[PDB]
Paper text:
Many Gram-negative bacteria exploit host cellular functions through the use of type III secretion systems (T3SSs) for host penetration and effector delivery.
Here, we report the crystal structure of the ordered AscG1–61 region in complex with AscE at 2.4 Å resolution. Each asymmetric unit contained two molecules of AscE-AscG1–61 complex. The helices α2 (residues 14–35) and α3 (residues 44–65) of AscE formed a pair of anti-parallel helices in the AscE-AscG1–61 complex with a topology similar to those in the crystal structure of apo AscE. In contrast, when in complex with AscG1–61, this region was induced to form a two-turn helix, α1 (residues 4–12), located in a perpendicular orientation to α2, similar to that which is observed by PscE in the PscE-PscF-PscG complex. Here, we showed that the structure of AscG1–61 in the AscE-AscG1–61 complex consisted of an anti-parallel three helices bundle, with topology similar to the first on-and-a-half of the N-terminal TPR of PscG/YscG in both PscE-PscF-PscG/YscE-YscF-YscG complexes. AscE residues Leu5 and Leu9 on helix α1; Leu20 and Leu24 on helix α2; and Ile54, Ile60, Ile61 and Ile64 on helix α3 formed a hydrophobic core between AscE and AscG1–61 through their interaction with AscG1–61.
Residue numbers in the entry:
A (entry chain A): 1 to 36, 42 to 65
B (entry chain C): 1 to 53
């Protein structure tokens, strides 16, 4: 049921965890400045990234 | 963003469906849906979300 990811975010791999979080925000910044039609697509992507950031915290 | 990161978000979404994070998983699912190569991927996430709700 549980993934390998969940166990790497639960404290067993502190470095992995902050690298993943780091790039997820990196990416978020990319699409956010991209958003300054085709906005609903990027906005959809911004939601997805932010969503992942919400889970990583709810399961760390 | 890049495929490797995307797969990490999908796994993250799948993990989320098992932690009462259906809204987050849905947001991820619909974005991945934008791609054709992730069909089944979004399928499972959604099916996992449907079964855990």
């Amino acid at each position: 049921m549980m993934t390998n990811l969940e166990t790497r975010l639960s404290g067993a791999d502190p470095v992995f965890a902050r690298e993943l979080h780091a790039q997820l925000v990196q990416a978020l910044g990319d699409v956010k400045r991209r958003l300054l039609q085709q906005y609903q697509q990027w906005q959809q992507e911004a939601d997805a990234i932010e969503a992942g950031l919400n889970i990583i915290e709810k399961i760390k | 963003m890049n495929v490797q990161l995307k797969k990490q978000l999908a796994e993250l979404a799948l993990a989320g469906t098992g932690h009462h994070c259906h809204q987050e998983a849905a947001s991820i699912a619909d974005w991945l849906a934008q791609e054709e190569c992730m069909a089944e991927c979004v399928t499972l996430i959604r099916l996992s979300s449907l079964m855990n709700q």
